[PDB]
């Protein structure tokens, strides 16, 4: 199995928990609690650059999220026919990944900051982000982003339209092709069931989950 | 058919990378100039961009916007992103350590005044505790003149490239490994690095107040 290190919370390891259970694939999480469990994979060597997430696979230790999300998704075929669709791929998940981190470090935004990032956030996704992947989906009118089969584009996507859903559930209303796309990738047998109760998927940052953040990363 | 063209403003920002990748490679490409906020509007009016950014790629019948996706297309198209798949994890993992630190330098000049000095002490910090020494712990762990396969790989490149601008910032923060030292210097006598770092190549200066000004122009910020 491969083996997530991380803390118990979505952070920088939630895109590579989707992508697994997308691919069928059974993992295992070793939780990290606090500074001192952080200091112990370093110690050991575990971390390249010393951070989290760091992904156990095939005998590797993959730090820095794209590294292990690159491989799991090659590994797997999830990852396009040849490389001129994983340069489509790469170019719709990127732009995923930019809205994605926005929405990511909200939780750390410095308080008098909030109000105004939180606006650029609903300004980027119904002006900018939305219209491009709603443009992708109308232009070939398939199921799926890429090469008219399930590849990483559509899960990753998939998993963002939840993250946007819980701040402005109003953002996709005026997306059909996108709206539609949600509800076929949560259809599929196994992300329906990471979707489940019980699943490994994480809830939202609380307060309590980004102190125990705070104490780890020490910051 | 038609060379590479790329599309940014003339200066390094998140194009240099690319501009790097592609001359390592050997491959000639043509560059488009946006000088003003109406250039780059003109590219969005036209559908060249899909985020309504650049940098942009235009390689192959494709325009690639987001920097990693044209630069995985290069390293991929030209035999610089390993042999296979064990191999592009590595690579990854290196690049992404690079492109970390990378970030840190590039936004370095739009930081607040009174937060300057602090984020420039962090940076030296992280280079000469933690980047440097896990790049110099590879190149030991296995002796061999690249990083990755003992074959060029882009991770070589992104990683020279770097030691550059860590240069350019202090010249003693690599004083304290040799064999990054070594592969800076192997690296740039390859034919196609040398002819890059020479005069007049599409290598980039450093970004002064007045290219930042032209950035905050087009850019709208
Ligand atoms: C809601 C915020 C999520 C929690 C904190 C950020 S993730 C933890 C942080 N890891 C990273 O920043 C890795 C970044 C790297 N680019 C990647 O994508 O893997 C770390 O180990 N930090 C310790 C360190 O840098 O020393
Ligand atoms: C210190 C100053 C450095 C200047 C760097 C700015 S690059 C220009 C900027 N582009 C991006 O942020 C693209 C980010 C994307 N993640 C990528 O890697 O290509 C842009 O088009 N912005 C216009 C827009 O987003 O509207």
């Given at each position: 199995?491969?083996?997530?290190?991380?803390?118990?919370?979505?952070?920088?390891?939630?895109?590579?928990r989707?992508l697994?259970?997308?691919?069928?694939?059974?993992?295992?999480?070793?939780?990290?609690?606090s500074?001192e469990?952080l200091?112990?994979?370093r110690?050991?060597?575990?971390?390249?650059?010393?951070?989290?997430?760091?992904?156990?696979?095939?005998?590797?230790?993959?730090?820095?999220?794209?590294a292990?999300?690159?491989?799991?998704?090659?590994?797997?075929?999830?990852?396009?026919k040849?490389?001129?669709?994983?340069?489509?791929?790469?170019?719709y998940?990127?732009?995923?990944?930019?809205?994605?981190?926005?929405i990511?470090?909200?939780?750390?935004?410095?308080?008098?900051?909030?109000?105004?990032?939180?606006?650029?956030?609903?300004?980027?996704?119904?002006?900018?982000?939305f219209?491009?992947?709603e443009?992708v989906?109308?232009s070939?009118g398939?199921?799926?982003?890429?090469?008219?089969?399930?590849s990483?584009?559509?899960?990753?996507?998939?998993?963002?339209?939840?993250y946007?859903?819980?701040?402005?559930?109003?953002?996709?209303?005026?997306?059909?092709?996108?709206k539609?796309?949600?509800?076929?990738?949560?259809?599929?047998?196994?992300?329906?069931?990471?979707?489940?109760?019980?699943?490994?998927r994480?809830?939202?940052?609380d307060?309590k989950?980004?102190?125990?953040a705070r104490?780890?990363?020490?910051?």
């Open positions: 199995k491969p083996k997530l290190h991380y803390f118990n919370a979505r952070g920088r390891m939630e895109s590579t989707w697994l259970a997308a691919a069928g694939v059974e993992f295992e999480e070793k939780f990290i609690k500074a469990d200091d112990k994979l110690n050991d060597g575990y971390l390249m650059f010393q951070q989290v997430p760091m992904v156990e696979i095939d005998g590797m230790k993959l730090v820095q999220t794209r292990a999300l690159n491989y799991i998704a090659s590994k797997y075929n999830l990852y396009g040849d490389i001129k669709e994983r340069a489509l791929i790469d170019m998940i990127e732009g995923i990944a930019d809205l994605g981190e926005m990511l470090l909200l939780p750390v935004c410095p308080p008098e900051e909030k109000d105004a990032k939180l606006a650029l956030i609903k300004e980027k996704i119904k002006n900018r982000y219209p491009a992947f443009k989906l109308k070939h398939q199921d799926y982003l890429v090469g008219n089969k399930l990483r584009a559509d899960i990753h996507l998939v998993e963002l339209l939840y946007v859903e819980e701040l402005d559930s109003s953002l996709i209303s005026s997306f059909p092709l996108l539609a796309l949600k509800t076929r990738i949560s259809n599929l047998p196994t992300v329906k069931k990471f979707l489940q109760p019980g699943s490994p994480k809830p939202p940052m307060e989950s980004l102190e125990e104490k780890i990363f020490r910051f």
